Amino acid sequence: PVIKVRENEPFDVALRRFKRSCEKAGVLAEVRRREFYEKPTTERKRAKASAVKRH
Amino acid sequence: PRRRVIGQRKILPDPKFGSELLAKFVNILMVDGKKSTAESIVYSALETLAQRSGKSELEAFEVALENVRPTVEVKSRRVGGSTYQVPVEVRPVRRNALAMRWIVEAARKRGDKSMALRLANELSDAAENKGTAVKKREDVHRMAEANKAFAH
Amino acid sequence: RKQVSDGVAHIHASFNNTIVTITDRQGNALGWATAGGSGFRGSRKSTPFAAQVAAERCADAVKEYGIKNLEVMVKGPGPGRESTIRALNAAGFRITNITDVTPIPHXGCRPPKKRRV
RNA sequence: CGGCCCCCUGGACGAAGACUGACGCUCAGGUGCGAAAGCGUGGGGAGCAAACAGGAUUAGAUACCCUGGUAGUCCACGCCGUAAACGAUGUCGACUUGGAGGUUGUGCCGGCGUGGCUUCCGGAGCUAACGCGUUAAGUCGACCGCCUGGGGAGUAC
RNA sequence: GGCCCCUUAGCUCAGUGGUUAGAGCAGGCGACUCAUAAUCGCUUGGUCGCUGGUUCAAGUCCAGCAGGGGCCACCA
Ligand SMILES: [Mg+2]
Ligand SMILES: [Mg+2]
Ligand SMILES: [Mg+2]
Ligand SMILES: [Mg+2]
Ligand SMILES: [Mg+2]
Ligand SMILES: [Mg+2]
Ligand SMILES: [Mg+2]
Ligand SMILES: [Mg+2]
Ligand SMILES: [Mg+2]
Ligand SMILES: [Mg+2]
Ligand SMILES: [Mg+2]
Ligand SMILES: [Mg+2]
Ligand SMILES: [Mg+2]
Ligand SMILES: [Mg+2]
Ligand SMILES: [Mg+2]
Ligand SMILES: [Mg+2]
Ligand SMILES: [Mg+2]
Ligand SMILES: [Mg+2]
Ligand SMILES: [Mg+2]
């Protein structure tokens, strides 16, 4: 997320644009997902459980 | 309570000054329901302070009261099951009540011969930043300042 | 001594601590400060207030270099991800870029086992 | 069974036509393949981590948490032959109302059809019940494997 | 035998001849929790060994001993 501040704009707008770029980029989700190790069976079960609950 | 039903109860200003604040202070100083013995002490202390300072009779009390009123206190709040010390604001009525109570308790612990003289000394010191109520207010302020990171 | 007027501020955000360091554009550090050394230990060390204080106290030690402009690049998911740059704004520094530099394996190694708390 | 490219190689499906003429189904003994951990000989070793050492928590803590860390995890060849190896549902064939999707072929003019595989709901019927329901646990045929109260015991010789 | 390190709260470490005796370390009282454990706030405190020196000005500079300390040296 390279956020280049442009001419004649305050700090708040650039800050909000950077925050939205990071939120849409999904960096925090990846960093959380890589904190520990997940056995293949555990993830295969959790994905199906989430899919069943959603539908 | 669980219901939010309670309200405010009317109070009569004191006769010779028409001030609700003096009424509340007298109530705080009253014991055993013997009110008539309370305003006597209050009046004696007020007149002794008035003659000692020479500024006024009612403005000295107001200045001493203002010198002690705090603006922040510490309570407990939780987010994930662990208790904290969080600083919170104080409403004006609570400020006045705390100031009066601190002044009374500070006055009650001395070695003079009369209670009115103790009151005179304590109001004087509060007006000139030497009473123990000043120490109470400062300690509360600094404990609130120490636990500043937890302020949501 | 020396005059630069153009620097870059690197932020290391972590669940336990935050580190702020200002360096020249060729990666030659001029100063740094941490929330841990700023008088905060234990639980308070992991709050955005600590990151704000650390950022301001670090900027307080780069005034002699006469820095006029800064850009910020930040890594880590910690809670100091936000208040640090606002505290830098309150120091009057010019802000030109805000960038994310958090590392990401494209597979990589194997993470440690989950804690059974 | 998962980054990208090349070489060798097994199966499945659809479309019209031709050819052989029952050459079929199932299968006791027999043969082959078969997760991970483990074993033998020779390599390699970033990260992780049985055993092991220290720090805590605790009445105790040979643990759960933290700091370290060796076999092992990786490669070539050779053994081992076991899993909640599960759809807890043997293989082959025929017949029996519907609705909503997914993936991949083909014919005629976005429309009208026609095959293969696959996900969810549900009718008759079945079932002790839960439930299954054209991918049956529904109605029949051919062959194989297995069961006969709980422990002792999938143990002893 | 010769050079050289210093002597300070209940304890350990700091302290420039002027207008400092400095912090940490145990305890006491409060703060939070229904209440401990962990956290936070305020504090009970000092003979600069004895003595002397020059010096307006000395814990401060010099030491005499003593105490606790190294090396140099060693053919009654
Ligand atoms: Mg537990
Ligand atoms: Mg057989
Ligand atoms: Mg293996
Ligand atoms: Mg092995
Ligand atoms: Mg091996
Ligand atoms: Mg080996
Ligand atoms: Mg490890
Ligand atoms: Mg471990
Ligand atoms: Mg092993
Ligand atoms: Mg078996
Ligand atoms: Mg399996
Ligand atoms: Mg079985
Ligand atoms: Mg079978
Ligand atoms: Mg159904
Ligand atoms: Mg039976
Ligand atoms: Mg039996
Ligand atoms: Mg039996
Ligand atoms: Mg057996
Ligand atoms: Mg056996």
From TrEMBL, chain A:
Source domain of life: Bacteria
One GO term of the biological process aspect: translation
Extent of Basic residues compositional bias: 45-55
GO terms for MF: structural constituent of ribosome
Keyword Transcription on entry: no
Annotated Gene Ontology cellular component terms: ribonucleoprotein complex; ribosome
Keyword annotations from UniProtKB, A to Z: Ribonucleoprotein, Ribosomal protein
Keyword set includes Ribonucleoprotein: yes
Similarity comment: family membership: Belongs to the bacterial ribosomal protein bS21 family.
Protein name in UniProt: Small ribosomal subunit protein bS21
This protein's encoding gene: rpsU
UniProtKB/TrEMBL annotation, chain C:
Molecular functions per Gene Ontology: rRNA binding; structural constituent of ribosome
InterPro entries: Ribosomal_uS11, Ribosomal_uS11_bac-type, Ribosomal_uS11_CS, Ribosomal_uS11_sf
Record carries keyword ATP-binding: no
Quaternary organization: Part of the 30S ribosomal subunit. Interacts with proteins S7 and S18. Binds to IF-3.
UniProt function note: Located on the platform of the 30S subunit, it bridges several disparate RNA helices of the 16S rRNA. Forms part of the Shine-Dalgarno cleft in the 70S ribosome.
Record-stated family: Belongs to the universal ribosomal protein uS11 family.
PANTHER family referenced in this protein's UniProt entry, alphabetically: 40S RIBOSOMAL PROTEIN S14/30S RIBOSOMAL PROTEIN S11 (PTHR11759)
The name this protein goes by in its record: Small ribosomal subunit protein uS11
Organism of origin: Escherichia coli O157:H7 (strain EC869)
Higher taxonomy: Bacteria, Pseudomonadati, Pseudomonadota, Gammaproteobacteria, Enterobacterales
